[PDB]
């Protein structure tokens, strides 16, 4: 018997609301931390929008055979958007692309926070 | 008219009976009779200026000596004033005529010079000078105050007060100061 | 092996009979020298040379003497009565 | 006067003295004691021999190198000889058991500063001067 | 000094006087000693007369008390008081335990103390002159006060004290000094070793001294 943060649906209506213009409607704004709000309210890029749609096609076209088409990106600076949940995006770190299944919890958080950029240390001598 | 110390302590209330300390102390001079122990003087310049320092200025100096906590005479002049009030409220004597005695007593008259030859640590009999004697006396007195004064609600103006008193008495059980004063001579009387 | 000093071991004497707490020590030894008939005659050799007597004495012991329990009432007024516990080594009341 | 005696009648003395004090010379003491005849060549200038095997020897002190050498068996003498094969490829011509002609290196005694216990040079293979085998246009078998 | 001179304290000392002939009225002699000088507690006495034979000579108020019932244990006679509300404040110490146990004779009371007698009541009084002795304390302090009043014998307890007697005026010698000894028993000797345990003493009658040792 488990639920999710603020209602995965309220947000799909919150984000794609009457004015589903800028990827992050001023609605989602009220939800994010100052740092994130800063960025969006400041100057977010458009590329971040065509990447958006790339996940879109991956989420539907794929049959319920739960086999999503990994979307590849270097946009580690992207802050997961509500509609970005469910898809598996391959994020570059330094060597290759990392495939991560987007859960409801990783929203408002930087897409980079999952693409481990370095292998911490094991030891011996 | 006569400028009393801290406004309430006649200087002429004391005299140096022993000839030793007569020139190695300050109570005696006209210039020494100060209201405040702060002179920002220029002692420590020639090689004996220290003498002309109003005995208590010296006490205050030797008193603000622990690192971080110290380096600010402003306050120290206080810790010494309160301590004088407190010494008075107990023996009601001219607290200079107390501190003074203490200075004369707490100064070791004998020390041992470490003279080692090829590993062996030998010592000899040495008679301690006057200037050195006073210096040691004060250094010692104060040295102790901090000893107890640490994690204690007892205050320096109190610790110090309680010290200057017994230091005058020669009370070998109540003066970290005179303890060494005796031991240094004793051990020294052994090495001699 | 833990005996208990005095314990009502019925007994008698008599001029008493019934029970009676008895302070019970174990038995000791006793010198003889120059009284014993054993001596009165066993003083010999016969006599410009000697030896001893057929039983004297190197045999082979047992490594376990015996408790000479010596129970003795005080009301019965008499008489220090001996008993015989056999098993060594051991000692009086512990316990 | 000095040690030597200056008498016209004492010639004999001086004479015997010189004949005596003269043994102190090695060059003298050397040839005088038929020493030359006892060496491996028996006085000789050169000696023929059969290659017992090509061995290599290490240079001494400040030098480090593999010297080419052949162990030879002298004919009438019949001794084991240590013989240094000269120039570059030289040892590549000396086949084991061939006939070789050997001579000494600078006064019979100390070997060239570099070599260790070698006292001889190899000049002929199957009776063919080495130099000849060393220069193409000359000879080879 | 347990020597021939005993009859010099007795025979030769039995008509000394200090005037003329020898008077015309009755006599009064004895033989001085003690009780045991122990400490009036642990061990110093038991039972058995000499005699001896006497009683008071002057007063007899001794010691007997404990509870509200110990007063009547000193009413039809005369003794000292231990009090009730004092054994928890002041019924013993020095001049206190004394009071009740410090008279002349000794003590003839009963017992009742508990955890208090190693330095107070029962304690501080022993060699002083009392510390719980044998006075058949069960029916009272009168019948056994035959060992605390008259007859006697010579109950010798507390601090020294005892008695003696044999004849009247003049008719004793070897049995005069040997009457003084006879005037001594469980006070001159007793059980395991007791033929002597002192240093000296005194004696006479009324004349003058006895043994000049």
């Amino acid at each position: 018997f488990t639920f999710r943060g603020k209602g995965l649906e309220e947000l799909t209506a919150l984000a794609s609301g009457s004015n589903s213009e800028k990827l992050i409607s001023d609605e989602l704004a009220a939800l994010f931390d100052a740092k994130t709000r800063r960025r969006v309210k400041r100057g977010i890029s458009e590329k971040y929008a065509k990447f958006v749609n790339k996940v879109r096609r991956s989420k539907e076209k794929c049959p319920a055979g739960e086999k999503p088409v990994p979307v590849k990106t270097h946009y580690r600076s992207m802050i997961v958007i509500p509609e970005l949940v469910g898809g598996i995006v391959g994020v570059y770190n330094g060597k290759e692309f990392v495939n991560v299944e987007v859960k409801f919890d990783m929203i408002g958080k930087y897409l980079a926070e999952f693409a481990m950029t370095y292998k911490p240390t094991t030891h011996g001598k | 008219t006569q400028p009393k110390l801290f406004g309430k302590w006649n200087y002429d209330e004391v005299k140096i009976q022993d000839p030793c300390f007569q020139n190695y102390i300050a109570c005696t001079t006209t210039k020494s009779q100060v209201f405040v122990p702060h002179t920002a003087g220029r002692y420590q310049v020639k090689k004996f200026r220290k003498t002309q320092c109003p005995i208590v200025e010296r006490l205050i100096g030797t008193l603000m000596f622990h690192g971080r906590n110290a380096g600010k005479k402003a306050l120290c002049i206080k810790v010494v004033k309160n301590a004088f009030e407190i010494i008075h409220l107990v023996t009601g004597r001219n607290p200079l005529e107390v501190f003074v005695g203490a200075v004369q007593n707490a100064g070791p008259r004998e020390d041992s010079t470490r003279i080692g030859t090829a590993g062996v640590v030998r010592k000899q009999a040495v008679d301690v000078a006057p200037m050195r004697r006073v210096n040691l006396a004060i250094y010692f007195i104060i040295k102790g105050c901090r000893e107890s004064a640490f994690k204690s609600m007892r205050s320096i103006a109190e610790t110090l007060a309680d010290e200057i008193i017994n230091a005058e008495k020669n009370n070998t059980q109540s003066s970290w100061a005179i303890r060494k004063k005796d031991e240094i001579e004793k051990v020294a009387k052994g090495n001699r | 092996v833990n005996v208990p000093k005095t314990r009502k071991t019925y007994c008698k004497g008599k001029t008493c009979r019934k029970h009676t707490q008895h302070k019970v020590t174990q038995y000791k030894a006793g010198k003889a020298s120059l009284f014993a008939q054993g001596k009165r005659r066993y003083d010999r050799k016969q006599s410009g040379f000697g030896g001893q007597t057929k039983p004297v004495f190197h045999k082979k012991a047992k490594t376990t003497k015996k408790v000479v329990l010596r129970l003795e009432c005080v009301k019965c007024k008499t008489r220090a009565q001996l008993t015989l516990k056999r098993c060594k080594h051991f000692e009086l009341g512990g316990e | 006067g000095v040690g030597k005696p200056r008498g016209i009648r004492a010639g004999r003395k001086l004479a015997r003295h010189r004949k005596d004090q003269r043994w102190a010379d090695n060059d003298f003491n050397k040839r005088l004691l038929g020493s030359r005849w006892r060496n491996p060549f028996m006085g000789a200038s050169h000696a023929k021999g059969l290659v017992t095997e090509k061995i290599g020897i290490e240079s001494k002190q400040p030098n480090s190198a593999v010297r080419k050498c052949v162990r030879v068996l002298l004919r009438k003498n019949s001794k084991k000889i240590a013989a240094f094969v000269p120039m570059d490829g030289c040892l590549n011509f000396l086949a084991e058991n061939d006939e070789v002609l050997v001579a000494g290196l600078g006064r019979q005694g100390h070997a060239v500063g570099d070599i260790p216990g070698v006292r001889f040079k190899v000049v002929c293979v199957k009776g063919i001067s080495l130099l000849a085998l060393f220069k193409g246009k000359k000879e080879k078998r | 000094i347990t020597s021939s001179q005993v009859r010099e304290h007795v025979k030769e000392l039995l008509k000394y006087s200090n005037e003329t002939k020898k008077r015309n009225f009755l006599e009064t002699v004895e033989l001085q000693v003690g009780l045991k000088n122990y400490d009036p507690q642990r061990d110093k006495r038991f039972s058995g007369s000499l005699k001896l034979p006497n009683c008071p000579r002057p007063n007899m108020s001794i010691c007997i008390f404990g509870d509200a019932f110990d007063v009547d244990r000193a009413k039809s006679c005369g003794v000292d008081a231990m009090s009730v509300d004092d054994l928890k404040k002041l019924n013993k110490n020095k001049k206190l335990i004394k009071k009740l146990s410090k008279k002349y004779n000794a003590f003839i009371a009963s017992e009742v103390l508990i955890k208090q007698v190693p330095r107070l009541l029962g304690p501080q009084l022993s060699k002083a002159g009392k510390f719980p002795t044998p006075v058949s304390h069960n029916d009272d302090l009168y019948g056994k006060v035959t060992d605390v009043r008259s007859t006697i014998k010579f109950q010798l307890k507390k601090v020294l004290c005892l008695a003696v007697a044999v004849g009247n005026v003049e008719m004793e010698e070897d049995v005069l000094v040997n009457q003084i000894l006879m005037s001594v028993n469980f006070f001159v000797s007793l059980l395991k070793k007791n033929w002597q345990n002192v240093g000296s003493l005194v004696v006479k009658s009324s004349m003058g001294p006895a043994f000049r040792l």
């Binding site: - | - | - | 290599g56 593999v66 080419k68 570059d88 490829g89 030289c90 040892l91 590549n92 | -």
Partner: protein, 68 residues
Amino acid sequence: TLAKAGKVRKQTPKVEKKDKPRKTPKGRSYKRILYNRRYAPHILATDPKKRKSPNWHAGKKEKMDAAA
């Protein structure tokens, strides 16, 4: 070693010799030429302390022409 025999020579690139342009006179002639190239009066003429090395002409085409 052993098989390491003549490692050097085997490794050396055989360069050829400049096929004599003309000839080298052998006889009083050679000794003559030498006499001329060095002890001829024009060289004993200039200082005997400042005359060149009989081989400074190490075969240097650049200094070869500068002299002649």
